[PDB]
Each structure stands twice: as structure tokens, then as C-alpha cells.
């Protein structure tokens, strides 16, 4: 009182020294129910793949990706990320997922990788410069490969030149090595392109079915369709927290409402045109709020 | 395919910088996973890392040569380069273009398999 | 900067004549970074065998790399005339990169 008066004598006097504000502490975040998961698990355990002469191609769309459920894992043989981390994939939002799904034999799971040479890399699949995505490979020798050879997988072994980043042209006409055409009919210098993979459980390393998942991480003008999960964890209540709803942020306490309320909002606004009640979004309760405690000493 | 084509001067006087330009065929040098590299040989001892070049033209260098060692890139001409100050003649050797691919893991390590391209090679030599 | 040591230098092996190369680490690399480098003489190298063991896209199955943490060992099987050049071993685990001296195989 007397460093505020600037006087070492105060008499009989009620003096407004300072001002108190209660600083919040926890902050917790909330953020609706992880509902509608992507269906990461169809593209990777689909009872039949496809040959990569024609690789299954997936759209992924308004759902949320738990990329974490593919990283958790050490089960995969190869997980080869490009551009993008793994760790924090969920935070990464991006607008648009493609799922590409083939079978390819061991010795060339590497010809995936961007940029590589090899007759599954140019001829058949191939990766643009710029890929931000990731290569996910496992053996699955039992699955695939049966008694007696696997005719089911073909690649194409010769085509006329390279194909495009991202394009599968499916062609059984008769190869042309030389310049006399031979019309469709197989013979010398013309051979069919579709090459049998022979899949065997005896067989090395190399020659074994893996199958292949590619994810790619598209971003374009369009808004975000394909967001990553949010934490939740617990709510707090009776205390000045801060808290954030929706990117809608505030530091006060968090109260119940008795007040009726309808079903499509969620915010409340208060005839000052500031916030008074906070719908919590994965909880049907209302949460009142309430500015914190503050005044002068 | 991505071909990379050293051009460089045969014999370069003393207390001159050495140019050398690697000619890339097919890769867009800006890629983000590229990573191109230098390397040189001398003759008789074991090959020695000069340079890589980071994403976007940034570049990191070998720290002992961090000090008289610089790397540029010429997208627009498709090919990058190697400028070496103060160059002696222990310091000249067969410089080799190089590529890698960085690519990220569940462990978490950026870096990866690397000098995977190779240019043909230039043998050059400092002398007076 | 990290030293790799390649034991022995030199080799004079007959054909169909198994080698090894024992590149052993100054400091430890868990990663198995390790990648072993051929190089033809008077010729660029090539990448011979990465991540410990690999078989890069074409290179014989007859080279397989080995080893892992501070030391590293390449083995050749059914030796051909076309595989007497100097071989390295190289660490991208940690930079700066090194590369070892180099081993040569003869006749």
C-alpha cells in the first residue's frame, strides 16, 4: 500500500493495491470420436491380389487413416517411406490417399524405389521423381504359391518402350522385336507379353511371392478429405483450464448446462458477443463456460 | 538411365578453383529424394567424400574440405556442380558424379541406400 | 571421421575359390549402414551389396554381404574371372561418409 501511494503513512484508508488473475494450468484438448477408419487393412490382407500387369488401384476418401496400425508392426519385410516420415503421418493431413496394390517376386521389390531400373520398374510399375509415399512389402510364400507352379501372377517382360510414371496399359497383342509383323500369332521375334511368375515353395528368396502395397500422398487445391486421428484423452471441469474446441480456443472453467440446446450446433454464442457455452463434440453433454476468476486486490 | 556426364577442365594451373559439372540425364535434380554427391579418388588410396547436396539446392559438406568446398545446381540447365578454392595438387584425384535416395523408416532414419549412380569419371590433375 | 580397415589388402585366389573381406568398423554401426562398393579397374564403381546383404539389381547372387554392428564380411562362392577388381566398404550411418582402402583379388 505504501510503494502504491508513494507515501509511508496511510490512515484508516481501503486502497486497491494490484490486480490477481488465476493462471490456468493443465490444458487439455478435445476432439470428436475417431469414427469412419479408412480401410487401410481391405488393400492389405485382400484375399487375392492382382498381377502388377494391371496393379489394383484404391481411392481413399472422407475418412480418417490410422497410419500408425501399418507402422506399429514389424511384421512388414520392407517399409520404405519417401518424402514423407512415418512418425507424425497422422498430424500430415492430405487431401487425397491412393492405395496401388501388386504381386512381385522378391528380387525386385527394390525396383519400386523411385527412379530404378529393372523390368518391373520401367516396363510395368513405375514411381514418379517426385513420390511422396510409402512401400510397404511382406513375403507370403504360404498365401500365394501352391503345388505344381503359380500361373496366376504375370508380368509383362517386353514392351515397345518405357511407360509413364503411374501407367498400366494392358497390351496381349503379340510382341514386335524386329520389323516383319507376324498379326497376333507367336513365333520367332514374336512373343506374348505376359510372363508366367512360377511361384514355388522350394524356390529362393528372390523367386517368392511378395506382396506389395504402395501408398501415395496426394495434396491439390481441393480441401483435405483424408485427416489424421486426434487426442482426446480426458476432460476437466470446476477449474479454470485452458481449453480448445473445434481450433475454437478459451481459458476458463468448464461447467454443466441445464438449458436446452440444439442438435446441429456447436458453439454458443453470448449477447456480447462472446463465447458462453462449448458443446463438447464426441460427448452429448454441454459444457458451460465461464470466465476465470479475476479482480483487484 | 539417369546417366550422369562429368565436364571438367584435364589440367588445371595451381591456385585456381576447380569447375566440374555433372550433366544429369532423366532426374529432375530438385526431387526431394535425390540426394547427388561428390566423390574423388587419388591415385593409389581409398575413395574420399567431398559433398552432398541437400533438397532444394541447399548443400552440406565434408568438414575438412567444408572450408574451401562449395556445390551449386543449374536446374534450369539440368546438371549441378562442384567449385573447389584453392586447390593443391594432393587435392585433385578422379572426381565421380553420384546419386542416393534418402528415404525415411519406422526407426526413423533419413538417410539410406546411396551412391547407387556413378558418372563415367574424370581424371584431373594440378600442376604448374 | 570413422576409419574402416579391410583385411587383407591383397588376395591371389583361383577361380571357384571362396574369399572374404573382413571391413571392420573403428566405432560400432547398428544400422548395418555398411555398404560394399566394387570398382572394375580403371573404371567408375558400382554398387556391389548394400544394407548389410543385398543383392543391389544385378549383382551375382554368388556375392552375399554379412556381418553387422563393428565388423562386416563379404563372401564370394564359385569365384569367376570377371570378379578380380578392388572391392570397398563405405558408412552412410554417420557423416562424414568414409570409404575403406580397398581390396584387390588376382589370379
Known amino acids: 500500500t505504501k510503494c502504491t501511494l508513494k507515501s509511508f503513512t496511510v490512515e484508516k484508508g481501503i486502497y486497491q493495491t494490484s490486480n490477481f488473475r488465476v493462471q490456468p494450468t493443465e490444458s487439455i484438448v478435445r476432439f470428436p470420436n475417431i469414427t469412419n477408419l479408412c480401410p487401410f487393412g481391405e488393400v492389405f490382407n485382400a484375399t487375392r491380389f492382382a498381377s502388377v500387369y494391371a496393379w489394383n488401384r484404391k481411392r481413399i476418401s472422407n475418412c480418417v487413416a490410422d497410419y500408425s496400425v501399418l507402422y506399429n508392426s514389424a511384421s512388414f519385410s520392407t517399409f520404405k517411406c519417401y518424402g514423407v516420415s512415418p512418425t507424425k503421418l497422422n498430424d500430415l493431413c492430405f487431401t487425397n490417399v491412393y492405395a496401388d496394390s501388386f504381386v512381385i517376386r522378391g528380387d525386385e521389390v527394390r525396383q519400386i524405389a523411385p527412379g530404378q531400373t529393372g523390368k518391373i520398374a520401367d516396363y510395368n510399375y513405375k514411381l514418379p521423381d517426385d513420390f511422396t509415399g510409402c512401400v510397404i512389402a511382406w513375403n507370403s510364400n504360404n498365401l500365394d504359391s501352391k503345388v505344381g507352379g503359380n500361373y496366376n501372377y504375370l508380368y509383362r517382360l517386353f514392351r515397345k518402350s518405357n511407360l509413364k510414371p503411374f501407367e498400366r496399359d494392358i497390351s496381349t497383342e503379340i510382341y514386335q522385336a524386329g520389323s516383319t509383323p507376324c498379326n497376333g500369332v507367336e513365333g520367332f521375334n514374336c512373343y506374348f507379353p505376359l510372363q508366367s511368375y512360377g511361384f514355388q515353395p522350394t524356390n529362393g528368396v528372390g523367386y517368392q511371392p511378395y506382396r506389395v502395397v504402395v501408398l501415395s500422398f496426394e495434396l491439390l487445391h481441393a480441401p483435405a478429405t483424408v485427416c489424421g486421428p486426434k487426442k482426446s484423452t480426458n476432460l476437466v471441469k470446476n477449474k479454470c483450464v485452458n481449453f480448445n474446441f473445434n481450433g475454437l480456443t478459451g481459458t476458463g472453467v468448464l461447467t454443466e448446462s441445464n438449458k436446452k440446446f440444439l442438435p446441429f450446433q456447436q458453439f454458443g454464442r453470448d449477447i456480447a458477443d462472446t463465447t458462453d457455452a462449448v458443446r463438447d463434440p464426441q460427448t452429448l453433454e454441454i459444457l458451460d463456460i465461464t470466465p476465470c476468476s479475476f479482480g483487484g486486490v | 538411365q539417369v546417366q550422369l556426364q562429368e565436364s571438367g577442365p584435364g589440367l588445371v594451373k595451381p591456385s585456381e578453383t576447380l569447375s566440374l559439372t555433372c550433366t544429369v540425364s532423366?532426374?529432375?535434380?530438385?526431387?526431394?529424394?535425390?540426394?547427388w554427391s561428390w566423390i574423388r579418388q587419388p591415385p593409389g588410396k581409398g575413395l574420399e567424400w567431398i559433398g552432398y547436396?541437400?533438397?532444394?539446392?541447399?548443400?552440406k559438406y565434408n568438414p575438412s574440405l567444408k572450408s574451401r568446398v562449395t556445390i551449386s545446381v543449374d536446374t534450369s540447365k539440368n546438371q549441378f556442380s562442384l567449385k573447389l578454392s584453392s586447390v593443391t595438387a594432393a587435392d585433385t584425384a578422379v572426381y565421380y558424379c553420384?546419386?542416393?535416395?534418402?528415404?525415411?523408416?519406422?526407426?526413423?532414419?533419413?538417410?539410406?541406400?546411396?551412391?547407387?549412380?556413378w558418372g563415367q569419371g574424370t581424371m584431373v590433375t594440378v600442376s604448374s | 571421421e570413422i576409419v574402416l580397415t579391410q583385411s587383407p589388402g591383397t588376395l591371389s585366389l583361383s577361380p571357384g575359390e571362396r574369399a572374404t573381406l573382413s571391413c571392420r568398423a573403428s566405432?560400432?554401426?547398428?544400422?548395418?549402414?555398411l555398404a560394399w562398393y566394387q570398382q572394375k579397374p580403371g573404371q567408375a564403381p558400382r554398387l556391389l551389396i548394400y544394407?548389410?546383404?543385398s543383392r543391389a539389381t544385378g549383382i551375382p547372387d554368388r556375392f552375399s554381404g554379412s556381418g553387422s554392428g563393428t565388423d562386416f564380411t563379404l563372401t564370394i562362392s564359385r569365384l569367376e574371372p570377371e570378379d578380380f577388381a578392388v572391392y570397398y566398404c563405405?558408412?552412410?550411418?554417420?557423416?562424414?561418409?568414409?570409404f575403406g582402402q580397398g581390396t584387390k583379388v588376382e589370379i
Open positions: 553420384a546419386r542416393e535416395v534418402y528415404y525415411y523408416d519406422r526407426s526413423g532414419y533419413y538417410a539410406s541406400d546411396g551412391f547407387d549412380i
Open positions: 532423366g532426374g529432375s535434380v530438385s526431387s526431394s529424394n535425390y540426394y
Open positions: 547436396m541437400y533438397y532444394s539446392g541447399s548443400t
Open positions: 566405432q560400432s554401426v547398428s544400422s548395418s549402414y
Open positions: 544394407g548389410a546383404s
Open positions: 563405405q558408412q552412410y550411418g554417420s557423416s562424414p561418409q568414409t
